[PDB]
Write a protein that binds this DNA or RNA. Structure first.
Length: 137
RNA sequence: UCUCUAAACG
């Protein structure tokens, strides 16, 4: 198999406030045409860019938030709904609680990234900056 | 509550 591709396919949100990207009910799984109905299960996590030591640049900005598919991204070895700090788990009725082998080992670096967007274009948390809801007034 | 990475003004 190819190695674990570890990064998010999608656009990442940036913090304005201080409270974590905590959804109601487990409802917050994004849309992506190049994915099946079984695929639609995943988690949100933080990216403080705050360095434990070595191999990264302090930049002082607010933090970011990334999504991953189930059994993919940095927490790829957790099952669904696991009890770890700064992970927010999300699922659809229609998804399967299996890890995503192809989606978790293939190469995102091949193109542009996928716009993070909810079903119906449901407006993401006011605490955060997304690619939608641009321009005024 | 909680440290994680490629610049932000939904």
């Amino acid at each position: 198999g190819l190695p674990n591709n570890t990064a998010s396919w999608f656009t990442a949100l940036t913090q304005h406030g201080k409270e974590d990207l905590k959804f109601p009910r487990g409802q917050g799984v994004p849309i992506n045409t190049n994915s099946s109905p079984d695929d639609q299960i995943g988690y949100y996590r933080r990216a403080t860019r705050r360095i434990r030591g070595g191999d990264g640049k302090m930049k002082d900005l607010s933090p970011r938030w990334y999504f991953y598919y189930l059994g993919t991204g940095p927490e790829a070895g957790l099952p669904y709904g696991a009890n770890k700090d700064g992970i927010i788990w999300v699922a659809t009725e229609g998804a399967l609680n299996t890890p995503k082998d192809h989606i978790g080992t293939r190469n995102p670096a091949n193109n542009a990234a996928i716009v993070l967007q909810l079903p119906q274009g449901t407006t993401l948390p006011k605490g955060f900056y997304a690619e939608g809801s641009r321009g005024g007034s």
